């Protein structure tokens, strides 16, 4: 619509919630492509912080031969 867009994240990434959701969504996709058990995807949903999201995928990816 011609109206002006409401609040936008153009200013800065001051919004960490959006990044947490995308980080979990992007990490979940990697499990889906590999075809791992849905349990690991569910575990990502409980990831408290992104550092745990990358380390959990990295430890799981490193665990495989």
Swiss-Prot record:
Species whose genome carries this gene: Streptococcus sp. group G
Lineage, uppermost ranks: Bacteria, Bacillati, Bacillota, Bacilli, Lactobacillales
Sequence repeat boundaries on the chain: 20-56
Gene transcribed to yield this protein: spg
Protein name as it appears in the record: Immunoglobulin G-binding protein G
Shown chain mapped onto the complete sequence: 254 to 299 of 593
Entry's localization field: Secreted, Cell wall
């Amino acid at each position: 619509m011609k109206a002006i867009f409401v609040l936008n994240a153009q200013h800065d990434e001051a919004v960490d919630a959006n990044s947490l959701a995308e980080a979990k969504v992007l990490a979940n996709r990697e499990l889906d492509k590999y075809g791992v058990s849905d349990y690991y995807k569910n575990l990502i949903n409980n990831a408290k912080t992104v550092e745990g999201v990358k380390a959990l995928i990295d430890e799981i990816l490193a665990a495989l031969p």
